[PDB]
Amino acid sequence: SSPGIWQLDCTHLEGKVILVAVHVASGYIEAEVIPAETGQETAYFLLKLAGRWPVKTVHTDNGSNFTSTTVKAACWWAGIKQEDGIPYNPQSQGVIESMNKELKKIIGQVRDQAEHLKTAVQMAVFIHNHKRKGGYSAGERIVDIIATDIQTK
């Protein structure tokens, strides 16, 4: 549950691919719609995430991205430790599935508003990260976790 640990998650809707990075300790997410999940796309997505948050470790979402030389290259470039995403703790499988279900539910709730899926996915990221659960939001928690970490060191 370190401040630096993120998990990649790839989910499908409307025949399109949604790539999600979840900051494990907070539940905070970033997401994008991509044409298909290739090493190049996943690498570019990781480069963007790591320029925005202090990404120390990524649990990749599958073996092909764990194997990908293009993904390993972006992890090397951005200072990220690439790990597998094996759920040694099986409650992981479950948290990620519930998150994909919540995100898809929010996407359906904004369909009268967003003409393209990529808009609906960013509206879903916005509502996911601002939702109060404290009740703190994921957005609040990730900032508190990383700030507290910067202040301990």
Added chain:
Amino acid sequence: SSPGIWQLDCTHLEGKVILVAVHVASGYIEAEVIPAETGQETAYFLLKLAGRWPVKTVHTDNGSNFTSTTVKAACWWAGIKQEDGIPYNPQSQGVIESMNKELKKIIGQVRDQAEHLKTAVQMAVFIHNHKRKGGGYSAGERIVDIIATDIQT
């Protein structure tokens, strides 16, 4: 200089358009390459930014985006107060021009590495936000401390 204030900045390279949002108090940025600066692109970029950080106010980069119905609609959706970016303090213009020069210099430093401009721009966002200035903190550190301190008050 509040924790919620961002400034839009649009700069040009390779005849392509780079759209930047700067968190004014920290210097932290996010950026994208877009085909042209249209209200729809700026709107979509603001929606993404605001799902990621608690954006309270955005100083728009020009009058067309200030005017744009599409931009105003994304600001309404995301809870953002849209303001002009008139530099009432003239040292603003200078600070933005210098960041555009520094960003372009980093893009040049990575051209042996990135085949597409959009990759070079994300590597630049990365190196910009991680740079220690000039006991010195990075922009990435400052934005987290600023917003965390604001949340705790």
